[PDB]
Design a protein around this ligand. Structure first.
Ligand SMILES: CCCCCC(=O)SCCNC(=O)CCNC(=O)[C@H](O)C(C)(C)COP(=O)(O)OP(=O)(O)OC[C@H]1O[C@@H](n2cnc3c(N)ncnc32)[C@H](O)[C@@H]1OP(=O)(O)O
Ligand SMILES: CCCCCC(=O)SCCNC(=O)CCNC(=O)[C@H](O)C(C)(C)COP(=O)(O)OP(=O)(O)OC[C@H]1O[C@@H](n2cnc3c(N)ncnc32)[C@H](O)[C@@H]1OP(=O)(O)O
Ligand SMILES: [Cl-]
Lengths: 116, 115, 116, 116
């Protein structure tokens, strides 16, 4: 169980070795002053998939993450983050997470973990 | 800001090209390991980043980096301090330090496209 | 013609709209103190493909780039970087550049440009 | 100075615990196809100061590096990479490297190594 993911209404859809798919919906409480999905909401979603995918290999903590924003989203938008393992080392691992909504690539997340 | 209120974040300081936001790690901000969720610390840093950049005019985030140095438990008071590192016509870059009790918890680097 | 690419012995293997492949070989002058390819060389290779691919869309300048290192390479290693377009906006574009050697992902590069 | 630094004509101006400064000049063979300093040359400069600074703490390997470009440079420009330690832990370290030329912040480099 992940308290923050549930607080944000994010749901784990699928889990597997080095991979995970998390889904959610942009709600009124996830917006910024401009009426669009807060950058922190989209990151949390992708970061959640990243955390889940990396821990399927054992305990791991976030080291460095990059988030590239491409499309703004309004409330009501359905979103999915799919994390895929691009590198797995004895001490670190890196994952690419695509944030997608209605077939559109909303953002691209890249993250590396430190394997405890 | 709906999301900021949702996370219980508060704006402490706002000036030209800078912003300071504070919050506290609550039970609902923890991850599967019982520590502050990376998404919560980023959201905090991202908030200061958005506020600081917007003192220069409307802008949209392009690329952001977050480096985590220390984990935090529930109850920890945390703060995000944003400073402008570069300002141009169409872009701006900010450094945001996430600190808790004098310790650097994480480092955020973000660039925006100025509208 | 790209002077730095030439200085480093990098060759353009392919160039098409929003895409590029650049290849080279790790030489003695590309090594760090440990005897492996300097992070700057690998980055320069990835960056070159990134620059070429992004400019097929029109003059563009780099804004932010990320480089994640997975495997070290020694002199004599053949390496190639494939740049692919992940997002194309009117004012910006983002590319993924896989750096490989013998079918293995040596490094991953992500870069965004400002479209003039 | 490792082989790549020598090839690029880079000089070490300062080296102390957790910090380093590397200087170089943009030569004709350091230019991109646009006639300005190649993004890979500026990064190699930053990456060199980064590598020197991190290894003052002992052997370390680069994991993730970010490079943000702010201003273009022409041939003849004197440039410096000034690296400072922002975090130091048992198994990792992160450094901020400012790339400056003639009093201007040309680029910002952020990088994290894994300490061996
Ligand atoms: C987000 C979803 C869950 C997935 C997991 C996450 O991403 S959770 C949120 C995002 N990520 C994080 O919080 C990771 C933070 N980073 C770290 O903990 C570390 O940098 C690291 C494990 C990657 C590397 O640490 P090292 O192996 O080098 O070991 P080191 O002992 O030097 O630890 C570094 C610093 O963290 C502290 N620290 C480590 N474990 C701690 C703990 N359980 N409780 C309190 N503090 C702790 C140390 O005291 C030190 O702070 P001092 O020097 O001040 O004494
Ligand atoms: C390496 C591959 C080559 C392909 C392109 C690259 O990636 S080259 C290497 C990597 N990238 C860079 O160096 C990117 C540098 N960044 C920039 O030029 C800029 O920040 C930018 C275009 C992204 C955004 O600038 P803005 O749109 O905000 O406008 P702004 O007016 O503030 O920028 C003014 C500065 O840029 C200059 N400038 C303007 N047009 C220029 C041009 N066509 N060629 C060179 N330089 C130019 C001005 O002279 C001044 O430099 P002075 O104050 O010196 O007079
Ligand atoms: Cl990054």
């Amino acid at each position: 169980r992940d308290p923050f993911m549930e607080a944000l209404g994010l749901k784990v859809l699928h889990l597997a070795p080095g991979e995970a798919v998390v889904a959610g919906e942009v709600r009124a409480d996830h917006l910024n002053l401009h009426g669009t999905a807060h950058g922190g909401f989209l990151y949390a979603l992708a970061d959640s998939a990243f955390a889940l995918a990396s821990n399927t290999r054992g305990p791991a903590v976030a080291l460095s993450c990059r988030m590239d924003y491409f499309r703004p989203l309004g409330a009501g938008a359905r979103v999915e983050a799919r994390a895929v393992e691009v590198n797995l080392s004895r001490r670190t691992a890196t994952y690419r997470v695509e944030v997608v909504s209605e077939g559109k690539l909303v953002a691209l997340f890249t993250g590396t973990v430190f394997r405890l």
